[PDB]
Design a protein around this ligand. Structure first.
Ligand SMILES: CNc1cc(N2CCN(C3COC3)CC2)nc(N)n1
Length: 154
């Protein structure tokens, strides 16, 4: 049993957009934009919805780039995160109640202030490789097990 989540990375030739999560799960960490997928919407619809809610941005096309499954010790539901990237965005990002957006140069990604798993799979995203990952967490800071592979179909 798993629950569906989205994650959107706006990746342009020299920069990537991240948001500082201001409240809730993962507050205090930079991340892409996203959240739970709702009943009645497709995964990609939910990714666009969360991007708009969290940054005001809309997008022409979202591309599937990864899937990451998370186990949190003691939590019954696996988190199934579908990761999307886009290069063309519509609008200028603006702060929301959940997210403070900032562009980062591709050699200045703030890994120490991101989810620890990003350090493993974010390079593959920047290298335009598609990937499947699995990370088992104890709490929010400690990776106990993980797998990571490149795939041809996300
Ligand atoms: C547990 N490791 C994670 C999890 C994660 N997501 C889970 C939570 N999710 C939504 C819950 O509100 C945002 C955002 C993506 N993103 C990243 N980069 N790493």
């Amino acid at each position: 049993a798993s629950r569906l989540y989205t994650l959107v990375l706006v990746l342009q030739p020299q920069r990537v957009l991240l948001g500082m999560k201001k409240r809730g799960f993962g507050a205090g960490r930079w991340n892409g934009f996203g959240g739970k997928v709702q009943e009645g919407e497709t995964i990609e619809d939910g990714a666009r919805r969360e991007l708009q809610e969290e940054s005001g941005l809309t997008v022409d096309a979202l591309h599937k780039v990864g899937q990451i499954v998370f186990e949190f010790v003691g939590e019954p539901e696996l988190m199934d995160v579908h990761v999307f990237c886009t290069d063309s965005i519509q609008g200028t990002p603006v702060e929301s109640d959940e997210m403070r957006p900032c562009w980062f140069q591709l050699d200045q990604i703030p890994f120490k202030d991101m989810w620890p798993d990003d350090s493993y799979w974010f390079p593959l995203l920047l290298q335009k490789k598609k990937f499947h990952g699995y990370f088992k967490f104890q709490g929010q800071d400690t990776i106990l097990d993980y797998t990571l592979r490149e795939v041809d179909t996300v």
